[PDB]
Structures are given as structure tokens and as C-alpha cells.
């Protein structure tokens, strides 16, 4: 599974510490200021110093189903990869389901993104990388799908390493809630939006109209007016209707090379079939390059944001 | 309203244990001798306007009565509490009832409850009062009896992010016209409910009485946003599994992608009676 030595390193430290700050309750957590809202928030866990994420969710439901719902989420402890959040525990609490994982010092890309404005192509190789990394890991390991792929659930750390986070484990999670929202922004393919049967391939979309986003620093979808890109009020369904009865975006083509034109090209193919696999984009000349190139990546985050 | 003002003689009115939560207010068990249900609402917008056209509706509830809607009793409003009180369905609602293994529906079980499903409804669209929330939770069956709920409600301006929270049970029932103009930040008050949209629900009702189950399985909002309003998932589950032509012909007129060519509920009356 092309698994480098210093990662395996930190995953062993993490899954030993795991086990130190061991099982727990509830008064073990204290609150410390707000990461945001679609709740999470950070958190000290008194019994090991060590500060952790909690993120409550409020589902007032049958009990049955609760009970239901954490058995299937304590998967997560066999989920453990390079690339996807350090997970620590999961537990029922007032009616309000709390998750604790790794604690990510610089955020999501979106909130990245926000603050650097627009993301360079040379680091968004590295990032495309580490995602059909942890997909196919994911695809592999325990043959499941993320099933929402966007920004705001990639996570970044001043430690230099790339992870994602709130992909889809319970099934009974997702029917009873996930499905109910809908927010200002869509990233789902054109092929669920219809409602046929939907694998990975779903998800390889997701990603590229994320890769269009944080490449120009605006949701990409309707495409930006003409003089307004060079430069840098919809309700819902129109939103909808244009992903599937118009063309998918593309990256501007005086900027960026043709690999990584080409890359989003093959991502945002609208049907499915003829989209990549991940198979087929981990040998993409796109992946070839970034994968090969030299990016201190802890020093573009600490700058950026302020960190250290 | 001090509920002094209703032709109902009123002394005391008892809450007991409470039967779920929702959008509107929480629904209490009441002893009016008989049982009733008791819902409490909470007026944020705390402007005159809010209250003037609730005084407006619930007074225009006064004015029903017909064995197939859910009788109107009392409302009171103690500003910024309010609450509106019915008579107490015994029995299931018909959403749990197709649901149940031991139950036995038929080609004639089936009409008989439709048809009284549009009395109920054909007398309400008389009078102009639109449901705006028809849906198979909001009708009761017991024994024989059939009694349509929460008439009206969604005219109303009270307590419920910028986010959207839309329940799957809920979409199903929910026209074309109305899920082209939802959008986070728009309430469900200037959302087009009508005559029509009503009747595409009894659509969806009736599908229910034939397949025991929601038309589009649960799947991500978003998806059956599009799929509803487009027309196309209405259309796909029409090919799917098909049940008979003269049953099939309401369901396809209910569902008229244009609200104009639907049936109004008169004339529902007459194609289900030229049935099996
Ligand atoms: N483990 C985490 N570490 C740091 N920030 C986090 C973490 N999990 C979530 N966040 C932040 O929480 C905020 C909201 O994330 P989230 O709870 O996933 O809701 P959302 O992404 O905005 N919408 P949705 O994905 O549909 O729930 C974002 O600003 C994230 O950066
Ligand atoms: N008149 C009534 N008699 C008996 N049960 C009722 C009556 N009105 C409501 N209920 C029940 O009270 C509960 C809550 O009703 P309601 O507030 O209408 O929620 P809902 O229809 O499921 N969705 P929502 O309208 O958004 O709250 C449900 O179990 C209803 O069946
Ligand atoms: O996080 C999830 N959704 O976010 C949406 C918000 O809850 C809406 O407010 C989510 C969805 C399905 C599922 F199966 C999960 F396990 C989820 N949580 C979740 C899963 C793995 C890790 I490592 C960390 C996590 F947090
Ligand atoms: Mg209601």
C-alpha cells in the first residue's frame, strides 16, 4: 500500500497513544473556542494533556437506532491511514453525538482557501495526491465511499501532513440525517443527482470540482463572466439543473499546465463510465510530476495563516 | 382569542403527555368529556402583522366541519404563546398503517379511502383553505373513519441556520412548483403552496396506498430536489413498476409536471369511482 516508513511512525505513536488516553465519558472534555458551524469545537481532554476535536451533532431519536449508529461508527478504530483523520473515540452523550479525532492546527481548505485567496497549482498536485491515496485505501480496505467529498472536510496541519475528514462510515448515520441537508453550494455528481446507483466514480467529481474552486478561488459553478476571470443571487435547483444539463467547468487554460488541465478535464467527465478510476489517475502524468516534485508544505501553511 | 369566543363551551382544559415534536410548536394529549390534542406555538416575529393574519385563519377555521376533516375546536393566543386546539384522532396514522404486515389492502379498500380523503379535501378547497401539508402522517384511519390533520398550519409565521433541513417523507408530497423555489433563508410561507400543489400530494398518497412505500427511495436531498422538480423522477418511477392503467391514470394526472393540467378534486371523485 506504497507505505513510506516516517508515516508509519506516526501511526504507530498515535495508535499507542490512543490506547494511553483509553476510554472515557463525558467531563473529560473542557471547551476552548469555535472551529465552525454547518458543531465542532476545540477541546482539552483532561486525563491526557493531549487537546483533541469534539464535534456534537443533535438528533433527538429512538434509542434503538442510536444504539445502532455507534456500533457502526466504532469501525473507525480499524480505519487508520496516512491520509485520513487519527480517530480516538465515539460515544452517546444528552442525545448529542460527539466525535473525537485528531485536532488539525490549520483547518479546512476552505477556511485556507478564505484566507490565501486562491490556492497555486504546484501545491494542489500534492493534495490530489494524498485524496486518491486515502479513496483507494478507503475503496480497498473496507470497500467503502466517502459519498461527500468537499473543502471544508479536508484538514491540514502545521506537522506538514494532509488527511480528510466526516466520510461516510454509517450507513443508518447517513438515512437519518446526512441525507437532510442541503446547503448553498453542491458538490455531488451528475449521476447521483439523478438517483442511479453511484460508486467511487461519484466521488472522483466531487474532488475535481473542489481541485476548480481552490485553483481560482471561486465556486466554479456558473462559470465566472468573462472579464470577471481574468480579474482574478441563484436559488438551488437552478444550481442543480445547470450540473446536469450543462457543460462541467474547466480550468483556465493561459495559467495552468495541460497536466493539470487535463487532470480536472477527466475528473469532471459527466458520465461516470468514461470519468477515471483511481487506477487510472494514480498514473496520470499530473500525479507522476507532484508526486516526484520537492514541496515544503508545513512552511506554505505556517505563512499563509501564521502558525508556527 | 380568549377561546371564550368559540361555540364550544369551554371551563378547563387539561394538558397531559406530550406526542411529538416539530416544526410547528410541540402537540400535547388534552382532556377537553373528551380527549384532545393541544399544539403550543411561539410567535418570534412578535409584529402586529404576524398575529393579525393568524387571527384571520384560525377564525376562518371556525367556519369547518365535515366528517373527514379533523374537527377545529378552539385556538387562544397569550401573545407571544399560542395554541390551537383539535379534536384527538384515535387509531394509526395511515402512514404507519399501509406500513403493517397485517394489514390487507385491496383494488376496493383502497378507492373507498381515497374517495373519502377527497371529500375531506373537496370541502376544504370550497371554502378556499388550502391544506399546504397534506401528507399520509396527517390522516387517520380507524375502523372505518378517515380524518385529515394540521389543515392550514403552514401559514403561520412562528418559531422553527442558513443552512436547509428537508425531511424525505416531506419532499416526496412536494409539487414541482415548490421545490424550484426553495433555497436556505427562504421560508416555508412564501413557498407557492395551492390548490394543485395539493393535489399532486393526494398523488403521492395514493401511490402510497398501492405501493406501501415513498415513490423515490431515501437518498440525499439535493438529489430529489432535482428529481422532482425537473419532472424526470416522477416520469422514471411512473416506467418502474407499474400497478394498472386505471389506477395508474390519477396518479399520472396528479402528477402533472404543469400545475394547470391537474385534476381538481371534484373530478377525482368521478375517476375513482370508475375503477375496479
Ligand atoms: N477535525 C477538525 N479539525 C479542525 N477543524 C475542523 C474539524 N472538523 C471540522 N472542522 C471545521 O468545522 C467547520 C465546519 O465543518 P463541518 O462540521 O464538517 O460542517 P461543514 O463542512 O461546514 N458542512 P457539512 O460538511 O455538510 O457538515 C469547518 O470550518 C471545518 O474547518
Ligand atoms: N389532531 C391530532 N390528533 C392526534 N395526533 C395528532 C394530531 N395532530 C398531530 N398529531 C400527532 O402529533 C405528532 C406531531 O405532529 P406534527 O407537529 O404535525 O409533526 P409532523 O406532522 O410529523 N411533521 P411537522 O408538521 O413538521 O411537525 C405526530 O405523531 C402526529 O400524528
Ligand atoms: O461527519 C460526518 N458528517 O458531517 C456532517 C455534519 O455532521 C452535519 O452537521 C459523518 C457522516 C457520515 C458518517 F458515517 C460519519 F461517520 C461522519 N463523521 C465522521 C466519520 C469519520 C471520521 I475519521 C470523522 C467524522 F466526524
Ligand atoms: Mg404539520
Known amino acids: 500500500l506504497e507505505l513510506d516508513e516516517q508515516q508509519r511512525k506516526r501511526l504507530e505513536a498515535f495508535l499507542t497513544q490512543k490506547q494511553k488516553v483509553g476510554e472515557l465519558k463525558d467531563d473529560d472534555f473542557e471547551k476552548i473556542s469555535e472551529l465552525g458551524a454547518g458543531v465542532v469545537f476545540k477541546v482539552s481532554h483532561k486525563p491526557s494533556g493531549l487537546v483533541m476535536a469534539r464535534k456534537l451533532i443533535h438528533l433527538e431519536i429512538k434509542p434503538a437506532i442510536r444504539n445502532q449508529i455507534i456500533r457502526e461508527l466504532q469501525v473507525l478504530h480499524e480505519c487508520n491511514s496516512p491520509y485520513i483523520v487519527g480517530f480516538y473515540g465515539a460515544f ?12 488539525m492546527d490549520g483547518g479546512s481548505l476552505d477556511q485556507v482557501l478564505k484566507k490565501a485567496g486562491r490556492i497555486p497549482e504546484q501545491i494542489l498536485g ?8 486515502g479513496l483507494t485505501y478507503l475503496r480497498e480496505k473496507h470497500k467503502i465511499m466517502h459519498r461527500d467529498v468537499k473543502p471544508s472536510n479536508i484538514l491540514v496541519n502545521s506537522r506538514g501532513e494532509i488527511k480528510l475528514c466526516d466520510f461516510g462510515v454509517s450507513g443508518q448515520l447517513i438515512d437519518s440525517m446526512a441525507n437532510s441537508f442541503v446547503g448553498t453550494r453542491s458538490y455531488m455528481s451528475p449521476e447521483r443527482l439523478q438517483g442511479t ?65 487535463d487532470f480536472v478535464n477527466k475528473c469532471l467527465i459527466k458520465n461516470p463510465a468514461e470519468r477515471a478510476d483511481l487506477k487510472q489517475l494514480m498514473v496520470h502524468a499530473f500525479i507522476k510530476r507532484s508526486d516526484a516534485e520537492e514541496v515544503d508544505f508545513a512552511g506554505w501553511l505556517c505563512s499563509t495563516i501564521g502558525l508556527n | 382569542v380568549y377561546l371564550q369566543e368559540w361555540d364550544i363551551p369551554f371551563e378547563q382544559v387539561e394538558l397531559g403527555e406530550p406526542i411529538g415534536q416539530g416544526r410547528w410548536g410541540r402537540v400535547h394529549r388534552g382532556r377537553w368529556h373528551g380527549e384532545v390534542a393541544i399544539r403550543l406555538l411561539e410567535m418570534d416575529g412578535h409584529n402586529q402583522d404576524h398575529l393579525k ?3 384571520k385563519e384560525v377564525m376562518n377555521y371556525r367556519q369547518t366541519r365535515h366528517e373527514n376533516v379533523v374537527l377545529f375546536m378552539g385556538a387562544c393566543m397569550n401573545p407571544p404563546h399560542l395554541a390551537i386546539i383539535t ?10 398503517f399501509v406500513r403493517d404486515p397485517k394489514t390487507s389492502l385491496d383494488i376496493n379498500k383502497t378507492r373507498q379511502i381515497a374517495q373519502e380523503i377527497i371529500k375531506g379535501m373537496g370541502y376544504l378547497h370550497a371554502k378556499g383553505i388550502v391544506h399546504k401539508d397534506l ?21 403561520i409565521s412562528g418559531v422553527v441556520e442558513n443552512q436547509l433541513k428537508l425531511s424525505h417523507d416531506w ?11 426553495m433555497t436556505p433563508g427562504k421560508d416555508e410561507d412564501q413557498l407557492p403552496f395551492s390548490k394543485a400543489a395539493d393535489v399532486y400530494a393526494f398523488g403521492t398518497v395514493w401511490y402510497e396506498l398501492q405501493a406501501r412505500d415513498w415513490p423515490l427511495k431515501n437518498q440525499a436531498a439535493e438529489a430529489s430536489i432535482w428529481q422532482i422538480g425537473s419532472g424526470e423522477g416522477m416520469k422514471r418511477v411512473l416506467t418502474s413498476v407499474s400497478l394498472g392503467k386505471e389506477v395508474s391514470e390519477i396518479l399520472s394526472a396528479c402528477w402533472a409536471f404543469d400545475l394547470q393540467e391537474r385534476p381538481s378534486f371534484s373530478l377525482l371523485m368521478d375517476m375513482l369511482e370508475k375503477l375496479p
Open chain 1, 197 to 261: 446507483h453511484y460508486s467511487v466514480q461519484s466521488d472522483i467529481w466531487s474532488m475535481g470540482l473542489s481541485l476548480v474552486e481552490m485553483a481560482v478561488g471561486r465556486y466554479p459553478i456558473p462559470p465566472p463572466d468573462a472579464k470577471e476571470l481574468e480579474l482574478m443571487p441563484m436559488a438551488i435547483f437552478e444550481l442543480l439543473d445547470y450540473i446536469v444539463n450543462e457543460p462541467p467547468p474547466k480550468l483556465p487554460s493561459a495559467v495552468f499546465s495541460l497536466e493539470f488541465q
Open chain 1, 92 to 103: 452517546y452523550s444528552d442525545g448529542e453525538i460527539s466525535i473525537c479525532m485528531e485536532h
Open chain 1, 126 to 133: 500534492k493534495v490530489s495526491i494524498a485524496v486518491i491515496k
Open chain 2, 171 to 181: 419532499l416526496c408530497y412536494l409539487a414541482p412548483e415548490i421545490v424550484r423555489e
Open chain 2, 87 to 96: 379534536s384527538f384522532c384515535k387509531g394509526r396514522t395511515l402512514h404507519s
Open chain 2, 135 to 155: 401528507k399520509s402522517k396527517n390522516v387517520f384511519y380507524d375502523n372505518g373513519k378517515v380524518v385529515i390533520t394540521d389543515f392550514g398550519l403552514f401559514g
Open chain 2, 53 to 55: 393574519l393568524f387571527k
